[PDB]
Design a binder for this molecule. Structure first.
Ligand SMILES: FC(F)(CNc1nccc2oc(Cc3ccccc3-n3cncn3)nc12)[C@H]1CCCCN1
Lengths: 276, 10
């Protein structure tokens, strides 16, 4: 049932920019998201003090996927436990408590990839969060699909556009509602040559070239959010990447880097059918 | 600037 949106696919209605994604299968400078556009978008919220930590995604009624550096990053003494965070699902507005719409859940357990490399390049920047109690789906809460080998192979290609969402800063200042932007996947060589950082296979970068004219990128607060694509084969939405890092935001000649979800699917399935 | 959420969750 994953990847089919109650207010769109289920009703055969399409959001205003999805066609841009399909046409390519041959947040800074983003736009406001329509209601129910990303029912899997999750907000990582800090209790004391109350603030937006990062983005995240719902992949089942009990699991949330996000970037590991959102929880653990020694360079900034960042190390959160289950009791320090809250998960807000079904939101649209960044600051308002959407009564009768959003759902807030406590965490039962956090799982960070054992080989997450915070010391150097944030390799394997991924983590799973098990909710204490299952959340009920609705028109605004619905899981995204995780890719299978075949979907990843045919969609994760240079020039193919994906979509990123989040309540992060609008510039390297904050949005009132969920922002959205469609970005093209960039060739590995171009990614490697734009930074001094050692890029691994567990990553991919996306963004427009400085001469493409179009702008767009993730930014602070957006980390841990989903990079999703719509399969033109079964019309479902699949999460291909996780907003991981970047040097600044929407800076020319630079690109956002994402955790390669499929490459780490083995670890994901292993944790799920072993701890819950 | 975040609106207070129910105490039940906190
Ligand atoms: F480039 C860096 F030096 C700095 N970048 C970051 N280091 C630690 C946490 C981050 O979280 C983000 C979030 C992000 C994602 C995509 C696009 C822009 C951003 N930024 C938000 N602020 C600055 N960049 N960038 C981060 C990274 C490279 C990888 C190893 C750690 N240092």
């Amino acid at each position: 049932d994953c990847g089919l949106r109650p207010l769109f696919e289920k009703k055969s209605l399409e959001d205003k920019t999805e066609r841009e994604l399909l046409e390519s299968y041959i947040i800074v400078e983003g736009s406001d998201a329509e209601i129910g556009m990303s029912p899997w978008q999750v907000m990582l919220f800090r209790k004391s003090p109350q603030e937006l930590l990062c983005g995240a995604s719902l992949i089942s009624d009990r699991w949330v996927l996000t970037a590991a550096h959102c929880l653990l990053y020694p360079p900034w003494d960042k190390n959160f436990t289950e009791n320090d965070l809250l998960v807000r699902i079904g939101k649209h507005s960044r600051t308002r408590y959407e009564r009768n719409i959003e759902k807030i859940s406590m965490l039962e357990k956090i799982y960070i990839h054992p080989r997450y490399n915070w010391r150097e390049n944030l390799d394997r920047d991924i983590a799973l969060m098990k909710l204490k109690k299952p959340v009920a789906f609705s028109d605004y809460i619905h899981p995204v699909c995780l890719p299978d080998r075949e979907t990843a192979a045919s969609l994760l290609q240079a020039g193919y556009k994906g979509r990123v969402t989040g309540w992060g800063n609008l510039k390297e200042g904050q949005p009132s509602v969920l922002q959205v932007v469609n970005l093209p996947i960039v060739e590995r060589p171009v990614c490697k040559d734009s930074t001094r950082i050692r890029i691994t296979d567990n990553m991919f970068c996306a963004g427009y070239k400085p001469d493409e004219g179009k702008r767009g990128d993730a930014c602070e607060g957006d980390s841990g959010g989903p990079f999703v694509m719509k399969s033109p084969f079964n019309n479902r939405w699949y999460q291909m990447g996780i907003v991981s890092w970047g040097e600044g935001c929407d800076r020319d000649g630079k690109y956002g880097f994402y955790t390669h979800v499929f490459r780490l699917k083995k670890w994901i399935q292993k944790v799920i059918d072993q701890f819950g | 600037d975040f609106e207070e959420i129910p105490e039940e969750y906190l």
